[PDB]
């Protein structure tokens, strides 16, 4: 019989984790400020990491990796990739990116690379003439990031429509890296438009800023069976060979890079965390990394299975009760 | 990278190694504060004794 | 020397106090005559907390014996360790108090109390470092009840800086058939809520239910009850009588047990529960001790712990055993039932372990809980009290000693206050 | 040569002091009667050990120590123990009645009645000193004396000795050995009142010591003598530079400049390796690399916490035994690529290193195996503020209901001193976070 606390009440994924745990008849849930817990589903911000691991008689486990934000904040990522020789300039799966401060900064370094076809991106904004974009980040006051906007996105047919890929990756306490076999394609509803990147919805394929401007696939969510079958028929490859291999190498590289800074191998508390990785596929079937989200939601179809895979891999390993839906990325 | 200020003894040695460079109250105020609560307390007590006298 | 002055008052107070001196005297290697016989020296290291020494290494209980009638005192003088109390310390009257609080507090008792204080003084005279006072008495009669609490009020006025501690036997219809006990107890609780630092609520309802249901005593005598009382009194005093780190004197215990001054009433528990004579054969495992220690069937106050929340808790283990196992079993109690310990007092359970076990046991555990569930005991007395008071019944027995209904209405209000203050912190 | 006076306050400071002076005597070859066969400076001398012992014309070497407990039980053990002839009656000071784990009773009530006697006995030593430099002060956070008298002494010391350094060895409270529910209240109070009076403080979390004893000495249930023999190693390590020939940390002022650019942030983290069970059926001995690396494992620190998330300001490595620099810089060169050692912009990433060739001394019959090389790291890392957030939390839960507050007020202290202490601690957590802000 174990105990846990819920301190992030707007978590779809850990709502189902707590639900799943209670329904086991072996997990009490306590008031969010009771110290004597085993598991903490934590706030998304200012989580009291320094307060874990000092409860004698209690093995404690938390659902975030302290420090993992370095991978999960747009401008942090940019810095992480540039300065980590592990990744670096021998890096070929990240678009050129530059942290920029709305007037240790590289807004200087940005203009010189712009000099050559040139298109870049930030509700943000994509454009092609520099002089105006910088004026935007100076509107709002928070440092955002500008990267090469992929001018040659691979385009689904019929529809001639751009998409991005989302993989859910689960890092357990022993730093096993698990990739959920089920991913999803967030598919732009209307057709991609070449010259003229000023309308969004068909350029920005984000679920929200799209379920608001729509046909082809239920919820603009294409799954792997269909996307792999489309890959066989249109391009004559498979998903694994053409896309997945690249993705798995990008997940493994990113998480291995920060491992020494966030591992809990020898720590007084343990950590696991679920990450969402977002990739774009381009014309030449090359895969690119866009962002990593540290607090991802899941695709509605796939919740039951993923949220039970978390329970089994991340939680029941450390607290055992009285086929695998993930792929272990090996390192 | 750069060992410095090496000093040696029969007992041991000591040095410095840089991998990279950078980038009140008085005795009276005390007696006042001490006696401020020796009073606050002597009063809390006489107040008790008074209630007991009733 | 951190001395304690023990007072026992009335029939109950003197009976259970006699039994306590019996037990702790055996435990400390002192005989029906006051001379030490220790196969150990742990015994004598803190003997002076409860004894003064004479020439010939004679030890005498720093106890004062008080009653308004000469019986009991005679049976105590003609009892097990009778000859070992200092004779000029029996302080008694003749008329008695006839189960009447006013008689003990205001009339009969007034006449006798000054002479009790003189013996107290003389005992207080000669302590290097007086901790304070411990009093034994019941709350349903007249002497221990009415005159016990008068005493407490006079001692606190002379010694406002010492610790005031009582073992207060609460009244129960299951044990006694005197009809004015709810009166005498509400008047005493009023006093105790204002003038003591720690009070052990030894509830005769619990003692009875334990003896009858659990020990299978079909005809419980006060000896059966008092067997449970001395065990518990032996237990809760362990940390004052041998060397140790936790709750080793009254004030430290009070700083550990009392987060709000009025909420200082404690639920003792004991394990294993035994009948007298009934010999023991297999000691408890450490996990056994623990589950029984917190089991409601082991509490000496008829209150349901799972109906409240523990504010604080002291736990005392006796006998050769592994501190690691004790450590583990106590953490598991707390982490398996954390809902029952207030979250806003971190680490509110403190644990002590003493190697000397209690006579005829190899393993024992004593529980001391400050639970909001004690409001149940005060609610029970309060209900008996109102049922007579709203018709002002039997009141003439008190008005005829000088008391006004008003005093009754105050005591009732203070105890109802206490109950609602216990509810505030249970819902926090 | 400049003298340092040791002051041990309360049970925890007194028993810990005893463990240190035991070790100091073994390390300097000084018998349980103060006779130091290898001193030829008979009746004096200005040697390095003379900073901690003075000498009698009769050849007796006597700690420059003052112990002080508001109750006699512990210090009585000192006046009857194996090192009785060592100290002289006038330096063992006891009251009769203690602070009852009550900061107020130790600061305000029973303090007033004894502060003078102790300041007397302390200036009595200051006057056998040619150039006294300051004080090392040993005390718990959680007892009433260790927190409340200690903070009273500190303020008078910063009056009778305005130009002398003050270091603390402070025991941080841990439930596995604690004896009071109100230790968090006492920890905050005495920190707030001692902060502006302490130059550098070494905080040892009984939690951390207690686990090194179970994990690495395989002792089921560590006692105070277990904890205290290990604390004495770490203290001896930290003070070895004051007692021996050398050029690192040669006086108390140097600890400040080496470990503390920011005065409020004067709580450097200690880490010690290796701790080896003297029961272990031979241990494969550990290299300069291995023990140096072991300094970056939380499980070896005197406070559990994660210096990966936090920046450094100063780092000192203190070696004892078979160590030469080439090994040290090779080891450092390696860990620097494998580990997250980020300093602050305004400090150079570097290490000050001290080597004493004499390996660590073990107490015959202790739990520690003798070892050929050992190391104590002193690192001022912001990560140590995890221990401030823990303690402040516990204080917030209890204080929001005024739980137990009436005990302190009862002794003259004003409820508001509570909230003032807690705001000062809230400023401290703010300072620390400012300095570790990147990522
Ligand atoms: C530890 C100290 C004691 O020894 C404890 C008690 C009481 N006491 C005197 C001894 C005694 C007992 N019985 C007697 C009958 C008698 O004859 C003239 C003469 C003496 C006694 C008790 C006993 O040993 O009985 C087998 C004894 C006594 C009582 C009891 C149980 C009990 O059992 C253990 N009830 C809980 C109540 C009673 O109200 C009830 O609620 O019943 C469930 C009970 O009414 C019924 C239906 O029984 C009764 C019976 C006489 C009736 C009148 C009121 N009072 C009050 C006690 C009480 C009693 C032992 C002090
Ligand atoms: N490591 C270690 N800690 C100790 C020791 N003795 C006491 N402590 C710590 O001190 C806390 C209790 O406060 P103390 O400093 O002992 O109080 P005191 O010195 O006895 O003085 P008062 O209690 O105020 O009378 C405990 O929680 C322990 O963590 C010891 O010998 N070794
Ligand atoms: N546990 C226990 N309770 C007792 C004993 N003697 C009396 N009582 C209780 O005390 C109450 C009567 O109090 P009483 O002795 O008349 O008080 P006094 O007149 O001041 O001595 C009864 O309800 C009993 O339950 C005893 O030896 N043991
Ligand atoms: Ca010398
Ligand atoms: Mg003490």
With beta carbons less than 8 A apart as the criterion, state whether A125 and A117 touch: no
What are the tokens at C264?
């200082």
Are C46 and C195 part of one and the same domain? Answer: yes
Substitution candidate for ligand 2 out of D171, D189, D223, D394 with most atoms within 8 A of CB: D171
Are A41 and A87 part of one and the same domain? Answer: no
We report the CATH number of the domain holding residue A71 as: 3.30.470.20
Nearest-by-Cβ selection for B15 from D197, D353, D414: D353
Are C153 and C287 part of one and the same domain? Answer: no
| Region for residue C29 given its phi and psi (left: phi exceeds 0; alpha: psi -120 to 50; beta: otherwise) | left
We report the CATH number of the domain holding residue A121 as: 3.30.1490.20
Nearest-by-Cβ selection for C346 from A3, A31, A35: A35
User: Rounded distance, CA C57 to CA C70, Å?
Assistant: 31
**Angle formed by the axes of helices A303-310 and A12-22, nearest 10°:** 70
**Angle formed by the axes of helices C148-158 and B27-53, nearest 10°:** 150
A-chain CB neighbours of D207 within 8 Å are 54
Are A187 and A259 part of one and the same domain? Answer: yes
User: Rounded distance, CA A274 to CA A292, Å?
Assistant: 10
What are the tokens at C231?
């065990």
With beta carbons less than 8 A apart as the criterion, state whether C133 and C103 touch: no
Compute the residue count for chain C: 428
C109 lines ligand 3 (CB under 6 A): no
Q: How many domains does chain C have?
A: 3
User: Rounded distance, CA C238 to CA C259, Å?
Assistant: 22
Domains with residue ranges and CATH for chain D: 1-268 (3.40.50.1440), 269-383 (3.30.1330.20), 384-439 (1.10.287.600)
Question: Mind giving me the DSSP string for C126-153?
Answer: T-SSEEEEEEEEESSSSIIIIIHHHHHH
Nearest in space to A240 (alpha carbons), one of A254, A251, A229, A255 = A229
Q: From the centroid of its chain, how far is CA D419?
A: 27
Are A34 and A130 part of one and the same domain? Answer: no
Interface test with C, best of A31, A57, A59 (most C CBs within 10 A): A57
* Residues paired with A62 in a beta bridge: A40, A271
Is A85 buried (19+), middle (13-18) or exposed (0-12) by CB count in 10 A? Answer: exposed
Are C324 and C200 part of one and the same domain? Answer: no
**Residue A89 DSSP SS3:** coil
Question: Quick check: D390 and A53 CB within 8 A?
Answer: no
Answer yes or no: is D179 a known binding residue.
Answer: yes
Are C37 and C173 part of one and the same domain? Answer: yes
The answer to whether the peptide bond before residue C177 is cis (omega within 30 degrees of 0) is no
D183 lines ligand 2 (CB under 6 A): yes
What are the tokens at D326?
């080439």
Q: Which domain holds residue A106?
A: 96-151
* Residues paired with C130 in a beta bridge: C3
We report the CATH number of the domain holding residue C287 as: 3.30.1330.20
Is A4 buried (19+), middle (13-18) or exposed (0-12) by CB count in 10 A? Answer: buried
**Angle formed by the axes of helices D224-243 and D10-27, nearest 10°:** 60
Nearest protein Cα to ligand 1, atom 42: C174
Those residues whose C-beta lies under 8 Å from the C-beta of residue A81, and which sit 6 or more positions away, are: A87, A88, A91, A94, A97
Are C213 and C301 part of one and the same domain? Answer: no
With beta carbons less than 8 A apart as the criterion, state whether D273 and D375 touch: yes
Question: Mind giving me the DSSP string for A146-196?
Answer: EEE--SSB--BTTTTB-EEEEEEEEE-TT--EEEES--EEEE-SSPP-SS-
| DSSP designation for D277 | B
User: Rounded distance, CA B44 to CA B40, Å?
Assistant: 6
The answer to whether the peptide bond before residue A158 is cis (omega within 30 degrees of 0) is yes
Query: What Å distances lie between residue C174 and C74, C170, C212, CA to CA?
Result: 28, 12, 11
Are C23 and C137 part of one and the same domain? Answer: yes
A-chain CB neighbours of C290 within 8 Å are none
| DSSP designation for C35 | B
Q: From the centroid of its chain, how far is CA D224?
A: 15
Method of determination is X-ray
The answer to whether the peptide bond before residue D274 is cis (omega within 30 degrees of 0) is yes
What are the tokens at D96?
């009769």
For chain D, say whether A70 makes contact (Cβ under 8 Å). Answer: yes
User: Rounded distance, CA D327 to CA D317, Å?
Assistant: 13
Are A141 and A193 part of one and the same domain? Answer: no
Neighbours of D146 (CB within 10 A): 32
Are C122 and C267 part of one and the same domain? Answer: no
Interface test with D, best of B8, B37, B40, B42 (most D CBs within 10 A): B37
Q: Which ligand is nearest to the CA of D48?
A: 4
DSSP E strand stretches across B1-54: 2-8, 12-20
Those residues whose C-beta lies under 8 Å from the C-beta of residue D402, and which sit 6 or more positions away, are: C260, D415
What are the tokens at C228?
């449970």
Query: What Å distances lie between residue D88 and C193, D14, D92, D124, CA to CA?
Result: 49, 15, 7, 12
Nearest in space to D196 (alpha carbons), one of D428, D377, D16, D396 = D428
Nearest in space to D182 (alpha carbons), one of D15, D384, D410, D424 = D410
Those residues whose C-beta lies under 8 Å from the C-beta of residue D136, and which sit 6 or more positions away, are: D4, D5, D6, D7, D167, D168, D169, D239, D252
Residues with their C more than 2.5 Å from the N of the next written residue in chain D, i.e. before a break, are none
We report the CATH number of the domain holding residue A54 as: 3.40.50.11480
Are A102 and A204 part of one and the same domain? Answer: no
Q: How many domains does chain A have?
A: 3
Tell me which residues of chain C, numbers 155 to 174, contact chain B at a CB-CB cutoff of 8 Å: 156-157, 160-161
Are A183 and A305 part of one and the same domain? Answer: yes
With beta carbons less than 8 A apart as the criterion, state whether D435 and D265 touch: yes
Q: Cα–Cα–Cα angle for D271, D274, D277, nearest 5°? A: 125
The phi, psi pair for D2, rounded to 5°, reads -130, 135
**Angle formed by the axes of helices C375-389 and C181-195, nearest 10°:** 130
Query: What Å distances lie between residue C285 and C274, C290, C319, C330, CA to CA?
Result: 16, 9, 11, 13
User: Rounded distance, CA A96 to CA A82, Å?
Assistant: 10
DSSP E strand stretches across D128-226: 134-140, 165-172, 200-205
User: For residues C31, C200, C276 and C359, what is the CA-based torsion angle, rounded to 10 degrees?
Assistant: -40
Nearest in space to D375 (alpha carbons), one of D438, D313, D296, D308 = D296
User: Rounded distance, CA D146 to CA D124, Å?
Assistant: 22
Nearest in space to D224 (alpha carbons), one of D11, D422, D69, D6 = D11
| Chains contacting A (3+ CB pairs below 8 angstroms) | C, D
User: Rounded distance, CA C82 to CA C94, Å?
Assistant: 20
Are A278 and A232 part of one and the same domain? Answer: yes
With beta carbons less than 8 A apart as the criterion, state whether A269 and A61 touch: yes
| DSSP designation for C30 | B
Tell me which residues of chain B, numbers 34 to 53, contact chain C at a CB-CB cutoff of 8 Å: 45, 48-49, 52-53
Q: From the centroid of its chain, how far is CA C355?
A: 23
Are A173 and A319 part of one and the same domain? Answer: yes
Are C66 and C92 part of one and the same domain? Answer: yes
End residue of a domain, out of A112, A136, A151: A151
Q: Cα–Cα–Cα angle for D124, D128, D133, nearest 5°? A: 95
Are C152 and C277 part of one and the same domain? Answer: no
C222 lines ligand 1 (CB under 6 A): yes
Question: Mind giving me the DSSP string for D358-382?
Answer: SPPP--TTSSBPP-SEEEEEEEEEG
What are the tokens at C74?
């005679």
Are A270 and A306 part of one and the same domain? Answer: yes
Answer yes or no: is D102 a known binding residue.
Answer: no
Those residues whose C-beta lies under 8 Å from the C-beta of residue C399, and which sit 6 or more positions away, are: C405
**Residue C245 DSSP SS3:** coil
Q: What own/partner pairs with CB < 8 Å and gap ≥ 24 does A27-30 have?
A: A27/A1, A27/A2, A27/A3, A28/A1, A28/A2, A28/A3, A28/A4, A29/A3, A29/A4, A29/A5, A30/A3, A30/A4, A30/A5, A30/C338, A30/C339
Q: Cα–Cα–Cα angle for A242, A245, A251, nearest 5°? A: 135
Interface test with C, best of B52, B53, B54 (most C CBs within 10 A): B52
Are A199 and A305 part of one and the same domain? Answer: yes
Are C53 and C198 part of one and the same domain? Answer: yes
C221 lines ligand 1 (CB under 6 A): yes
Nearest-by-Cβ selection for B21 from D158, D332, D348: D348
DSSP E strand stretches across C188-271: 198-203, 265-271
User: Rounded distance, CA C101 to CA C153, Å?
Assistant: 15
Those residues whose C-beta lies under 8 Å from the C-beta of residue C219, and which sit 6 or more positions away, are: none
Are A75 and A114 part of one and the same domain? Answer: no
Tell me which residues of chain B, numbers 11 to 30, contact chain D at a CB-CB cutoff of 8 Å: 11-27, 30
With beta carbons less than 8 A apart as the criterion, state whether A282 and A288 touch: yes
With beta carbons less than 8 A apart as the criterion, state whether D6 and D17 touch: yes
Query: What Å distances lie between residue A71 and A11, A265, A289, C387, CA to CA?
Result: 20, 19, 12, 71
Task: Identify the residue whose tokens are 């370095």.
Answer: A70
Are C276 and C362 part of one and the same domain? Answer: yes
User: Rounded distance, CA D328 to CA D417, Å?
Assistant: 48
Q: Annotated catalytic residue: which of D254, D386, D411, D417?
A: D254
End residue of a domain, out of C350, C373, C396: C373
Q: Are strands C130-138 and C163-170 parallel, antiparallel or unpaired?
A: parallel
With beta carbons less than 8 A apart as the criterion, state whether D253 and D334 touch: no
Nearest in space to A34 (alpha carbons), one of D391, D386, C339, C306 = C339
End residue of a domain, out of C235, C259, C283: C259
Nearest in space to C104 (alpha carbons), one of C138, C63, C155 = C138
Neighbours of C87 (CB within 10 A): 8
3-state helix, strand, coil in chain C (%, to 5): 50, 20, 35
Those residues whose C-beta lies under 8 Å from the C-beta of residue D384, and which sit 6 or more positions away, are: D203, D267, D268, D269, D303, D305, D310, D432
Nearest in space to C309 (alpha carbons), one of C271, C278, C348 = C348
We report the CATH number of the domain holding residue C405 as: 1.10.287.600
Task: Identify the residue whose tokens are 């438009």.
Answer: A193
A-chain CB neighbours of C338 within 8 Å are 3, 30, 34-36
Are C345 and C215 part of one and the same domain? Answer: no
Q: From the centroid of its chain, how far is CA C183?
A: 20
Rounded distance from Cα C74 to ligand 1 centre (Å): 26
End residue of a domain, out of A63, A86, A111: A63
Nearest in space to A15 (alpha carbons), one of A6, A27, A23, A24 = A6
Catalytic status, residue D254: yes
We report the CATH number of the domain holding residue C248 as: 3.40.50.1440
User: Rounded distance, CA A260 to CA D337, Å?
Assistant: 10
Q: Which domain holds residue C408?
A: 374-428
How close D137 gets to chain A, by Cα (Å)?
27
| Interface list for chain D against chain B, based on CB atoms closer than 8 Å | 104, 108-109, 111-112, 155-156, 158-159, 196-197, 244-248, 319, 324-325, 328-329, 332, 336, 343-358, 410-414
**Residue B17 DSSP SS3:** strand
User: Rounded distance, CA A154 to CA A135, Å?
Assistant: 31
User: Rounded distance, CA C186 to CA A205, Å?
Assistant: 75
Nearest in space to D150 (alpha carbons), one of D68, D63, D259 = D68
Are A86 and A101 part of one and the same domain? Answer: no
């Amino acid at each position: 019989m174990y105990t846990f606390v819920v301190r992030d009440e707007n978590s779809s994924v850990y709502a189902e984790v707590s639900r799943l745990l209670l329904a086991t008849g072996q997990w009490k849930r306590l008031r969010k400020d009771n110290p004597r817990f085993n598991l903490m589903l934590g706030e998304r911000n200012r989580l009291p990491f320094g307060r874990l691991g000092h409860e004698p008689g209690l093995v404690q486990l938390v659902n975030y990796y302290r420090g993992a934000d370095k991978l999960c904040r747009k401008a942090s990522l940019v810095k992480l990739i540039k300065t980590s020789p592990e990744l670096s300039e021998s890096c070929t799966w990240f678009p050129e990116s530059y942290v920029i401060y709305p007037t240790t900064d590289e807004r200087e370094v940005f203009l010189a690379a712009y000099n050559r076809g040139n298109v870049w991106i930030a509700g943000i904004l994509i454009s092609s003439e520099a002089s105006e974009l910088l004026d935007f980040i100076d509107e709002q006051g928070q440092v955002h990031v500008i990267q090469k906007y992929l001018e040659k996105p691979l385009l689904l047919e019929p529809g001639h429509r751009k998409f991005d890929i989302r993989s859910w990756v689960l890092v357990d306490h022993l730093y096993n890296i698990y990739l959920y076999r089920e991913g999803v394609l967030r598919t732009s509803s209307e057709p991609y438009n070449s010259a003229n990147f000023q309308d969004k919805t068909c350029h920005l394929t984000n679920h929200c800023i799209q379920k608001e401007y729509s046909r082809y696939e239920e919820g603009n969510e294409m799954f792997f069976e269909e996307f792999n079958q489309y890959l066989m028929d249109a391009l004559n490859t498979t998903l694994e060979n053409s896309i997945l291999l690249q993705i798995k190498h990008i997940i493994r590289s990113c998480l291995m890079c920060i491992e020494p800074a966030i591992s809990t191998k020898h720590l007084h508390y343990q950590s696991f965390q679920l990450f969402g990785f977002d990739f774009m596929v381009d014309e030449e079937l090359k895969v690119w990394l866009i962002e990593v989200n540290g607090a991802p939601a899941c695709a509605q179809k796939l919740y039951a299975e993923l949220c039970q895979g978390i329970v089994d891999v991340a939680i029941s390993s450390v607290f055992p009760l009285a086929t695998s839906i993930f792929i272990k990325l090996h390192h | 990278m750069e060992v410095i200020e090496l000093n040696k003894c029969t007992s041991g040695q000591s040095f410095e190694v840089i991998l990279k460079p950078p980038s009140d109250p008085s005795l009276e105020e005390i007696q006042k504060k001490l006696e401020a609560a020796e009073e606050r307390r002597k009063y809390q007590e006489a107040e008790l004794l008074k209630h007991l006298a009733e | 020397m951190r001395e304690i002055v023990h007072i026992q008052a009335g029939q109950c107070g003197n009976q259970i106090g006699a039994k306590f001196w019996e037990v702790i005297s055996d435990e400390h290697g002192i005989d029906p005559t006051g001379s030490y016989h220790g196969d150990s020296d742990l015994q004598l290291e803190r003997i002076n907390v409860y004894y003064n020494e004479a020439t010939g290494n004679k030890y005498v209980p720093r106890a004062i014996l008080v009653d308004l009638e000469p019986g009991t005192m005679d049976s105590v003088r003609s009892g097990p360790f009778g000859q070992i109390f200092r004779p000029d310390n029996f302080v008694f009257g003749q008329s008695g108090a006839g189960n009447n609080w006013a008689k003990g507090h205001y009339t009969e008792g007034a006449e006798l109390v000054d002479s009790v204080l003189d013996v107290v003084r003389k005992e207080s005279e000669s302590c290097d470092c007086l901790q304070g006072f411990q009093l034994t008495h019941s709350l349903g009669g007249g002497t221990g009840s009415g005159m016990g609490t008068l005493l407490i009020s006079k001692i606190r006025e002379e010694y406002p800086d010492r610790i005031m501690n009582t073992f207060s036997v609460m009244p129960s219809p299951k044990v006694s058939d005197t009809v004015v006990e709810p009166y005498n107890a509400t008047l005493s609780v009023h006093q105790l809520v204002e003038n003591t630092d720690e009070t052990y609520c030894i509830d005769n309802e619990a003692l009875y239910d334990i003896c009858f249901r659990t020990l299978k005593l079909t005809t419980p005598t006060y000896g059966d009850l008092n067997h449970l009382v001395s065990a518990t009194m032996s237990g809760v005093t362990t940390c004052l009588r041998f060397p140790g780190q936790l709750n080793a004197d009254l004030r430290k215990l009070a700083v550990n047990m009392v987060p709000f001054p009025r909420l200082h009433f404690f639920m003792p528990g004991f394990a294993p529960l035994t009948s007298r004579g009934s010999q023991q054969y297999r000691a408890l495992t450490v996990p056994e001790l623990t589950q029984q220690m917190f089991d409601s069937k082991n509490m000496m106050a008829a209150c349901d712990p799972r109906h409240g929340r523990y504010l604080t808790v002291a736990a005392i283990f006796r006998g050769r055993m592994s501190m690691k196992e004790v450590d583990e079993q106590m953490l598991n109690v707390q982490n398996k039932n954390s809902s029952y310990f207030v979250e806003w007092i971190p680490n509110n359970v403190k644990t002590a372990v003493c190697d000397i076990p209690p006579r005829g046991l190899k393993m024992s555990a004593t529980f001391i809980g400050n639970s909001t569930a004690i409001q149940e005991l005060f609610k029970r007395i309060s209900e008996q009290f109102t049922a007579m008071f709203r018709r002002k019944a039997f009141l003439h027995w008190y008005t005829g000693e000088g008391m006004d209904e008003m005093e009754f209405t105050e005591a009732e209000s203070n105890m109802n206050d206490l109950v609602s203050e216990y509810q505030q912190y249970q819902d926090a | 040569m400049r003298e340092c006076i040791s002051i041990h306050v309360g049970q925890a400071g007194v028993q810990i002091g005893n463990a240190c002076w035991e070790l100091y005597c073994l390390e300097h070859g000084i018998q349980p009667d103060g006779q130091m066969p290898s001193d030829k400076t008979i009746g004096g001398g200005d040697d390095s050990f003379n900073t901690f012992f003075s000498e009698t014309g009769a050849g007796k070497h006597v700690p420059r120590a003052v112990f002080v407990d508001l109750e006699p039980t512990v210090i009585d053990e000192v006046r009857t123990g194996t090192y009785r002839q060592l100290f002289h009656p006038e330096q063992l000071i006891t009251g009769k009645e203690d602070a009852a784990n009550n900061y107020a009773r130790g600061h305000y009530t029973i303090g007033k009645e004894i502060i003078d006697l102790v300041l007397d006995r302390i200036r009595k030593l200051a006057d056998q000193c040619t150039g006294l430099q300051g004080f090392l002060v040993f005390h718990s956070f959680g007892g009433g004396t260790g927190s409340g008298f200690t903070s009273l002494l500190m303020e008078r010391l910063s009056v009778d000795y305005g130009k002398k350094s003050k270091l603390e060895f402070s025991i941080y409270p841990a439930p596995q050995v604690s004896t009071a529910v109100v230790e968090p209240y006492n920890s905050i109070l005495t920190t707030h009142t001692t902060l502006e009076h302490s130059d550098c403080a070494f905080m040892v979390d009984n939690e951390a010591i207690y686990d090194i004893c179970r994990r690495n000495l395989d002792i089921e249930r560590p006692t105070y003598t277990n904890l205290n023999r290990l604390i004495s190693q770490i203290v001896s390590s930290i003070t070895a530079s004051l007692r021996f020939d050398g050029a690192l940390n040669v006086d108390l002022t140097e600890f400040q400049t080496n470990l503390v650019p920011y005065p409020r942030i004067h709580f450097p983290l200690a880490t010690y390796a290796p701790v080896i069970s003297a029961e272990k059926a031979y241990h494969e001995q550990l290299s300069v690399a291995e023990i140096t690396n072991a300094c970056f494992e939380p499980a070896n620190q005197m406070v559990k916490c994660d210096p990966r998330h936090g920046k450094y300001m100063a780092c000192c490595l203190l070696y004892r035994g078979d160590v030469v620099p080439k090994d040290v810089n090779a080891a450092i060169a390696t860990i620097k690529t494998k580990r997250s050692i980020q300093f602050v912009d305004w400090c150079p990433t570097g290490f000050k290193v001290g080597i004493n060739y004499q390996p660590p001394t073990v107490v015959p019959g202790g739990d520690l195996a003798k070892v050929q090389r050992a190391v104590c790291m002193l690192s001022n890392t912001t990560a140590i503020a995890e221990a401030w957030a823990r303690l402040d939390h516990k204080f917030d839960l209890m204080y929001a209901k005024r739980a137990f507050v009436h005990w302190y007020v009862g002794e003259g202290m004003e409820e508001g001193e509570f909230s003032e202490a807690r705001e000062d601690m809230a400023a401290l957590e703010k300072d620390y976070e400012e300095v570790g802000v990147d990522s």
